[PDB]
Amino acid sequence: KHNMKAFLDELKAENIKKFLYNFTQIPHLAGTEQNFQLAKQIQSQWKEFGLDSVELAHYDVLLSYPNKTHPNYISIINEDGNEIFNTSLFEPPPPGYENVSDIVPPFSAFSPQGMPEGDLVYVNYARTEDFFKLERDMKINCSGKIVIARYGKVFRGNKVKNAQLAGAKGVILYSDPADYFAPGVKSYPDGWNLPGGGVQRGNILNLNGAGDPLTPGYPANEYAYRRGIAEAVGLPSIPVHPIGYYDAQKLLEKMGGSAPPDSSWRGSLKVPYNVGPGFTGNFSTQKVKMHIHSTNEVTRIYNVIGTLRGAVEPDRYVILGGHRDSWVFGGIDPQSGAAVVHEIVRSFGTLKKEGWRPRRTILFASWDAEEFGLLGSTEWAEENSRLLQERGVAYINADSSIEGNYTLRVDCTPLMYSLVHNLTKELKSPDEGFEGKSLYESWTKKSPSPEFSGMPRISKLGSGNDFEVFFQRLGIASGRARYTKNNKFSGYPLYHSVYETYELVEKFYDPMFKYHLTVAQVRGGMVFELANSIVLPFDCRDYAVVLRKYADKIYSISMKHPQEMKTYSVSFDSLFSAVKNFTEIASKFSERLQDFSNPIVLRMMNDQLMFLERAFIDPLGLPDRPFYRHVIYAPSSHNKYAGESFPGIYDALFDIESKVDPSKAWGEVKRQIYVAAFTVQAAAETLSEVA
Amino acid sequence: KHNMKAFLDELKAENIKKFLYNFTQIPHLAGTEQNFQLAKQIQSQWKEFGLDSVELAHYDVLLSYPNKTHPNYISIINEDGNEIFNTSLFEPPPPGYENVSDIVPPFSAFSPQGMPEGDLVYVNYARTEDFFKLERDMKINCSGKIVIARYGKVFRGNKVKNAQLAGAKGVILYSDPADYFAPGVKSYPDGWNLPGGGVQRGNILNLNGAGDPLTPGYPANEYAYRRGIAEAVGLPSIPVHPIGYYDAQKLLEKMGGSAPPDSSWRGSLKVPYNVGPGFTGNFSTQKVKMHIHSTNEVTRIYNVIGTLRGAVEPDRYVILGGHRDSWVFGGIDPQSGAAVVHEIVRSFGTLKKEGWRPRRTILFASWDAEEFGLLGSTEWAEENSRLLQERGVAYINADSSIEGNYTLRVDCTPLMYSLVHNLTKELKSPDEGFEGKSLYESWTKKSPSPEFSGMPRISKLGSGNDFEVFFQRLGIASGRARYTKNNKFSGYPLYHSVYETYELVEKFYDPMFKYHLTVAQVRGGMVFELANSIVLPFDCRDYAVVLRKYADKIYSISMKHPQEMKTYSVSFDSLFSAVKNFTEIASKFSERLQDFSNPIVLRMMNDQLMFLERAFIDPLGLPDRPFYRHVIYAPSSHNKYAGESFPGIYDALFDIESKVDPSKAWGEVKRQIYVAAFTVQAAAETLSEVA
Ligand SMILES: *[C@@H]1O[C@H](CO)[C@@H](O[C@@H]2O[C@H](CO)[C@@H](O[C@@H]3O[C@H](CO)[C@@H](O)[C@H](O[C@H]4O[C@H](CO)[C@@H](O)[C@H](O)[C@@H]4O)[C@@H]3O)[C@H](O)[C@H]2NC(C)=O)[C@H](O)[C@H]1NC(C)=O
Ligand SMILES: *[C@@H]1O[C@H](CO)[C@@H](O[C@@H]2O[C@H](CO)[C@@H](O[C@@H]3O[C@H](CO)[C@@H](O)[C@H](O[C@H]4O[C@H](CO)[C@@H](O)[C@H](O)[C@@H]4O)[C@@H]3O)[C@H](O)[C@H]2NC(C)=O)[C@H](O)[C@H]1NC(C)=O
Ligand SMILES: *[C@@H]1O[C@H](CO)[C@@H](O[C@@H]2O[C@H](CO)[C@@H](O)[C@H](O)[C@H]2NC(C)=O)[C@H](O)[C@H]1NC(C)=O
Ligand SMILES: *[C@@H]1O[C@H](CO)[C@@H](O[C@@H]2O[C@H](CO)[C@@H](O)[C@H](O)[C@H]2NC(C)=O)[C@H](O)[C@H]1NC(C)=O
Ligand SMILES: *[C@@H]1O[C@H](CO)[C@@H](O[C@@H]2O[C@H](CO)[C@@H](O)[C@H](O)[C@H]2NC(C)=O)[C@H](O)[C@H]1NC(C)=O
Ligand SMILES: *[C@@H]1O[C@H](CO)[C@@H](O[C@@H]2O[C@H](CO)[C@@H](O)[C@H](O)[C@H]2NC(C)=O)[C@H](O)[C@H]1NC(C)=O
Ligand SMILES: *[C@@H]1O[C@H](CO)[C@@H](O[C@@H]2O[C@H](CO)[C@@H](O)[C@H](O)[C@H]2NC(C)=O)[C@H](O)[C@H]1NC(C)=O
Ligand SMILES: *[C@@H]1O[C@H](CO)[C@@H](O[C@@H]2O[C@H](CO)[C@@H](O)[C@H](O)[C@H]2NC(C)=O)[C@H](O)[C@H]1NC(C)=O
Ligand SMILES: *[C@@H]1O[C@H](CO)[C@@H](O)[C@H](O)[C@H]1NC(C)=O
Ligand SMILES: *[C@@H]1O[C@H](CO)[C@@H](O)[C@H](O)[C@H]1NC(C)=O
Ligand SMILES: *[C@@H]1O[C@H](CO)[C@@H](O)[C@H](O)[C@H]1NC(C)=O
Ligand SMILES: *[C@@H]1O[C@H](CO)[C@@H](O)[C@H](O)[C@H]1NC(C)=O
Ligand SMILES: *[C@@H]1O[C@H](CO)[C@@H](O)[C@H](O)[C@H]1NC(C)=O
Numbered sequence A, B: 001k002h003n004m005k006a007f008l009d010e011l012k013a014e015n016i017k018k019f020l021y022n023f024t025q026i027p028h029l030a031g032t033e034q035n036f037q038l039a040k041q042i043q044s045q046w047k048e049f050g051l052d053s054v055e056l057a058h059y060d061v062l063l064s065y066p067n068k069t070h071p072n073y074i075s076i077i078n079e080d081g082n083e084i085f086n087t088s089l090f091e092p093p094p095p096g097y098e099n100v101s102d103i104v105p106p107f108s109a110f111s112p113q114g115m116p117e118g119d120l121v122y123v124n125y126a127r128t129e130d131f132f133k134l135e136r137d138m139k140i141n142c143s144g145k146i147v148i149a150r151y152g153k154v155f156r157g158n159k160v161k162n163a164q165l166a167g168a169k170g171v172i173l174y175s176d177p178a179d180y181f182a183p184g185v186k187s188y189p190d191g192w193n194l195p196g197g198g199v200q201r202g203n204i205l206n207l208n209g210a211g212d213p214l215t216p217g218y219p220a221n222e223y224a225y226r227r228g229i230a231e232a233v234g235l236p237s238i239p240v241h242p243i244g245y246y247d248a249q250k251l252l253e254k255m256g257g258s259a260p261p262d263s264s265w266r267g268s269l270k271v272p273y274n275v276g277p278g279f280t281g282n283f284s285t286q287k288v289k290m291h292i293h294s295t296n297e298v299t300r301i302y303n304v305i306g307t308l309r310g311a312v313e314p315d316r317y318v319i320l321g322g323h324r325d326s327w328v329f330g331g332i333d334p335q336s337g338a339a340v341v342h343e344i345v346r347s348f349g350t351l352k353k354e355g356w357r358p359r360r361t362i363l364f365a366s367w368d369a370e371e372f373g374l375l376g377s378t379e380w381a382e383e384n385s386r387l388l389q390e391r392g393v394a395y396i397n398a399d400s401s402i403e404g405n406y407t408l409r410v411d412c413t414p415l416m417y418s419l420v421h422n423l424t425k426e427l428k429s430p431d432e433g434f435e436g437k438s439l440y441e442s443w444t445k446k447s448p449s450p451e452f453s454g455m456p457r458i459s460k461l462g463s464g465n466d467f468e469v470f471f472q473r474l475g476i477a478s479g480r481a482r483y484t485k486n487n488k489f490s491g492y493p494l495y496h497s498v499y500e501t502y503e504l505v506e507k508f509y510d511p512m513f514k515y516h517l518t519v520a521q522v523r524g525g526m527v528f529e530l531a532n533s534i535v536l537p538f539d540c541r542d543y544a545v546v547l548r549k550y551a552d553k554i555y556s557i558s559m560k561h562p563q564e565m566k567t568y569s570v571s572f573d574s575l576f577s578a579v580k581n582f583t584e585i586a587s588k589f590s591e592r593l594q595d596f597s598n599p600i601v602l603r604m605m606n607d608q609l610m611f612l613e614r615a616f617i618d619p620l621g622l623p624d625r626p627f628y629r630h631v632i633y634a635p636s637s638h639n640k641y642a643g644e645s646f647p648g649i650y651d652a653l654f655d656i657e658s659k660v661d662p663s664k665a666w667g668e669v670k671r672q673i674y675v676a677a678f679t680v681q682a683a684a685e686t687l688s689e690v691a
């Protein structure tokens, strides 16, 4: 038979291993010839694997690169202008790769050029609350200072935005061993820890979903009109550069000024973690100078798009997508994901060559330039938005399959919760001690739901990956699954470093490729069910449950301000009424879904299921973030990686006690309650009987 | 049999007459108790006629009314402040209605209050080109003046916007007999002409599609958050009032200053049509003073929504809608339309009681507050946008059925051209001299296409009626049809006057109700075909033809500026390429549509037809007009009643030789060409094979 079990059994750990090795021998930086060659290879292989059509979709987008003959670095400079200490120009390359060319040195993509010189202020993780602590409590002024921040906790672009708005003239990002060095494990190449010369690359944009900074709204095709750089979306206005903890110790060790306010501001280096500004007495005339010469350049990128035409509903699309571009070798990020996609395509192709086709169309995507701001996925979705709007059933992401080997991590829409529970109960756990048990059992044991006994944790989608345009802009039900560590937004120690290699994975993460295989079964099984189940495998009742949880949560935030809610008559009654109505109507829809040979009622009902995520989209977008249109979820305004629920109301309430016109601030809270209550009711009504 | 002929044969002229009489005995002003009672009557009758469900949908929107105890009027005031002439406080009521209560006196709805006093300037029709002529050529400054303008040619709201931006402190609108008095016809009650005491009511908003001025984007339901009046959409900032030509002669006769620039500025009154400013020598110390005391008030309105559930595709909606609120008796506007809708519902109900149901769902709507800015239709569409987005096949409007008795007038999307041609070839002409001939024959003879031999004229949809939200905001294929005169945007003489009565229609327009019956057959036949045809009756190839015409036209406007197109490299190549591609893909889709027992391919193909109008929607809207989202058509920025093609490019090019930064202006032209080329290509691609 051709069923899910046939599909799953065809997946092989050994193939995933072969593909990972093949994808990680040379760097595949977006916009480089090597990454174009890999795109062509993937295209050719997906054709040989059996897909109906496999095309490259190219765009010309703004990318950023260091200048090869004018390198970026940071100095401590004495009063005579002698540079007495310089940060490294590159990470010491790993064993056997010391002769690999075209390793991009560490840099912060999209940093402007500049050579700012000044006094350092240490700002912990550079979070919103860290700047509150500095400015409001400690009375430390960052204006005209160079800020030094440790990576971790929030997306690095939010750190830069926070430093910019604090008046900083430059930002230095570094990896503290508190966050990037697990006690009792060896540094690469002898274990999976970050050495002191390791450095995390990464872009520092604040795109808010825009895609290519020059073409918001429209694909960056051959005739596209581009904004000038001054009007580009999301570029930082101050220079930024990342360094490792050997170099960071040299910058931090001389810091004076005020003591850290408490222990949560202290990392693991042998320094005081003084906040500054500037250095202690003897070194007080020394300064820090950045030298940043990177350039932004419009550059061609290439997505690979593979189609497996559906037998019955070819106009309904289930999409499996993940990126292909990497910072250097991409041993984990993204090739551990891309190798799993490659094997999934191979398995679907094997069934196809035997005469099988999925009920609905499956689209497979190898996205480019994800590392530079989700550019490949976003441009393609901008080009194809009308098709995706009207035909998109679901999107399953496929970045790194493993970021650890402890347990599964799933983030998805509530519409997929039941699908994920049912699928994981039918898969074998790969975990030591759970042989013969289900993946559901091991996952639930290791990552219990905080809400429900005997259920696993499933998180909200935020952003920082290629599902963003599909979910937050277009409102297509989306999900992701990967293996993870026991720091959830910080990344694993070797993230975006030259040390993320095939050997890292094969030696230290997954030598038997069993975790990769389990992730292939989860991602692949989800796509199989979404593309093949007669009734789409979405349970609207699961959205009703979470909407009540999110309403309770946002009401509880507001109720920290009872006097103001009395004064401005701030009521959540409409939102609770909408949620109650959604619960009622969803329950009745579920009964009809169980209770109907009629393909029109089926498809009418499948259309109701498919357009339910779509109904949470507001065509006017969220305030000042027009590309985040989903009213229930958006990436947190303080941390792109985290999802926030009822984001319009959440941001209206955030730090509201600081606003100088409380009448206006609370009016905007009420406006957001109305928009949310209306959207929930309108989504509910899409599930009512149609006439 | 139950087929279109059965439906059409059931329609009766005598019933339409009975309904028109019933709907026009008392005023039905939006927000009044009389109009709520009529809503309840219509609801009850549509239920008895056989509809499955008939509900009222109410909203609380901003309306505007004169103050009953402080009337609006205009004076000529002498230097001592004696008001030596006053305009009328009401129109002399028509015979037998002199005791009707609650006739709203003439006023301009949404005028602010004020008592501005000043010198008059006469501005012809107050069009953009009239202000260009005054300000640029004649060097006349309207700042701080009261402008007097004749009604006609463009929507009165555009006149007010133009006067406001010229710096006017008040606007007086009047009906000139040149535009509102047909030579050789008697004034009401002895014929259909406007008497000198007649006055045209009408709102003067510039909503640009927003709906209720206080709740743009969202329905004005019970919990809605409202803007403050200062942030309301579309309200004028200067007082405005309309008068008849007896009163206008008294204001114009003393005008001095400069002579009218040419004869196109002279109407038919025995005055010089001096442009001013101010009065001739002897009266130069006299001024004009307005006294406006109207109030804006949030008021409940009621739509009636009737559903006839489809037998096969109940989740596909064909909508027949038109307004019910009138300024006074609504003898033509809108009850000549509403009576036709009532008879159409009655006829569909007759088939339904015999066991018939249409294939798709038909929704029937009696909209409220159309006269105050399309408020009822727009609020309901805001409430139901997700349902309409995903399920809306077509919208057919149904305002006034007759505005004359000369020939048919059809405005619609190109997708309906073939439907309209085919239907009119099967209907009998009601015209004298064409007995036994088709309506297509009489219509084509009387209103020949300017493009094609042996075809009738069909115009572009603009706005000024309830199809706006469906077509320009939501992108649902829309059409309208009515009988008209041989002044196309000016209205008929008694438009929005107390004289628009049942007797006006019965005596002077359509005594045998044969024109009303013909319009019922056209509107009703269109709804029948849209709701019943197996394949939706849309021909995508007709859109390809018009897109080329519109591309040629916009290129020709640009080519008035060859040096600038050379300098700024302004190319229309992408737009022509998109149009060529749309033509090719549409031709291939049409072949497949002819060449496919498979209901999924059918419905897939019907979905492609239904979503083709939707594909012309840009979710970012047009510049500064977020509710006009269709890229091919928008209401003209100079005349809400007229449609403009490629409006984004058209407005970027308008008066471009006057812009002080030509580089920026031409850059925006290029940006609009890219948006249009992309949208045309994206719409084309929705017709490609789906996978
Ligand atoms: C959840 O679903 C329920 C339906 O089960 C839905 O209930 C609706 O609530 C609205 C808003 O409260 C009701 O609106 C009322 O409608 C009647 C006419 O039917 C009006 O007369 C009422 O207005 C009067 O009273 C108001 C309140 O005191 C006054 O402000 C006003 O000036 C009038 O005096 C009022 O508009 C509506 O009838 C029900 N519909 C039902 C029961 O079918 C509820 O709105 C849904 N929740 C959300 C968030 O949508
Ligand atoms: C109408 O439909 C046609 C398809 O029938 C479609 O044609 C496409 O045109 C684009 C834009 O011209 C082509 O883009 C080229 O793609 C190749 C790879 O296939 C690239 O190598 C080309 O780039 C080079 O040349 C450019 C121009 O000189 C340079 O600017 C660039 O730097 C490169 O050197 C170029 O991107 C595309 O291949 C075809 N697709 C086909 C034929 O299938 C056309 O775009 C449609 N019209 C609209 C408005 O969409
Ligand atoms: C990764 O695998 C691919 C596919 O097997 C290899 O590319 C092939 O290499 C052979 C030998 O040079 C060529 O003849 C084929 O044309 C290639 N096939 C393609 C591109 O589809 C590639 O060499 C492998 N890369 C590494 C680094 O091992
Ligand atoms: C840090 O790097 C800088 C730049 O390369 C070094 O300073 C330069 O030294 C050279 C040769 O001695 C001089 O000709 C340049 O004028 C210097 N450039 C600048 C910008 O100062 C510096 O010596 C290095 N510091 C350390 C400690 O290695
Ligand atoms: C997950 O599996 C459960 C258990 O099989 C499914 O729930 C059953 O679905 C069938 C078919 O509708 C019903 O007859 C049963 O009553 C359901 N059992 C329950 C609710 O306990 C559920 O549909 C599956 N989820 C999917 C497919 O998304
Ligand atoms: C318009 O027609 C309607 C419906 O025939 C009339 O309303 C009915 O009037 C009778 C007699 O008063 C009542 O018993 C019914 O309750 C009404 N039916 C309804 C409202 O559905 C109405 O009187 C007519 N109006 C005019 C001005 O002729
Ligand atoms: C135009 O109307 C105004 C307002 O009613 C008239 O002026 C008023 O006359 C009364 C009684 O004679 C005075 O008590 C008021 O003080 C006047 N009001 C104002 C505002 O001036 C005026 O007479 C009318 N003009 C004509 C020609 O009929
Ligand atoms: C309008 O009527 C024409 C003439 O009947 C229809 O065109 C015909 O459609 C049938 C069915 O597809 C074809 O087999 C013929 O070749 C067509 N004749 C032509 C193009 O001259 C046309 O489809 C009708 N328009 C509608 C229904 O919107
Ligand atoms: C990079 O630096 C070199 C050497 O100083 C310089 O000549 C060139 O302008 C720079 N390249 C850029 C900005 O692309
Ligand atoms: C901080 O720095 C600059 C001093 O140049 C000053 O303009 C700014 O107002 C200061 N802000 C606070 C809050 O102290
Ligand atoms: C993989 O699992 C084993 C068992 O805990 C351990 O040796 C190793 O630390 C894990 N690797 C990583 C990268 O967590
Ligand atoms: C209308 O005018 C009367 C009489 O002058 C006045 O008392 C009242 O305030 C006005 N009504 C309004 C503004 O609604
Ligand atoms: C017209 O009127 C006012 C005079 O008060 C002046 O401020 C304005 O600049 C004038 N404009 C032109 C174009 O003459």
Ligand SMILES: *[C@@H]1O[C@H](CO)[C@@H](O)[C@H](O)[C@H]1NC(C)=O
Residues within 6 Å of the ligand: B192, B404, B405, B485, B508, B509
């Ligand atoms: C109706 O038609 C006849 C014939 O031309 C004519 O008496 C009359 O002017 C027409 N009525 C109107 C309002 O045009």
Ligand SMILES: NS(=O)(=O)N[C@@H](CCC(=O)O)C(=O)O
Residues within 6 Å of the ligand: A202, A203, A333, A370, A371, A372, A373, A374, A399, A463, A464, A465, A640
């Ligand atoms: N490849 S990844 O680490 O999962 N995503 C990248 C890019 C994310 C973004 O730009 O939103 C990052 O977080 O730096």
Ligand SMILES: NS(=O)(=O)N[C@@H](CCC(=O)O)C(=O)O
Residues within 6 Å of the ligand: B202, B203, B333, B370, B371, B372, B373, B374, B399, B463, B464, B465, B640
């Ligand atoms: N009833 S009608 O005359 O066709 N439409 C009204 C309202 C139009 C509008 O506000 O857009 C008018 O033109 O004044």
Ligand SMILES: [Ca+2]
Residues within 6 Å of the ligand: A210, A211, A212, A214, A215, A216, A217, A218, A219, A220, A378, A379, A382
């Ligand atoms: Ca773009």
Ligand SMILES: [Ca+2]
Residues within 6 Å of the ligand: B210, B211, B212, B214, B215, B216, B217, B218, B219, B220, B378, B379, B382
């Ligand atoms: Ca509204």
Ligand SMILES: [Cl-]
Residues within 6 Å of the ligand: A397, A398, A399, A400, A465, A480, A481, A482
């Ligand atoms: Cl992922």
Ligand SMILES: [Cl-]
Residues within 6 Å of the ligand: B397, B398, B399, B400, B465, B480, B481, B482
């Ligand atoms: Cl109409």
Ligand SMILES: [Zn+2]
Residues within 6 Å of the ligand: A323, A333, A334, A370, A399, A400
């Ligand atoms: Zn990644």
Ligand SMILES: [Zn+2]
Residues within 6 Å of the ligand: A333, A371, A496
């Ligand atoms: Zn990454």
Ligand SMILES: [Zn+2]
Residues within 6 Å of the ligand: B323, B333, B334, B370, B399, B400
């Ligand atoms: Zn009307």
Ligand SMILES: [Zn+2]
Residues within 6 Å of the ligand: B333, B371, B496
């Ligand atoms: Zn009207």
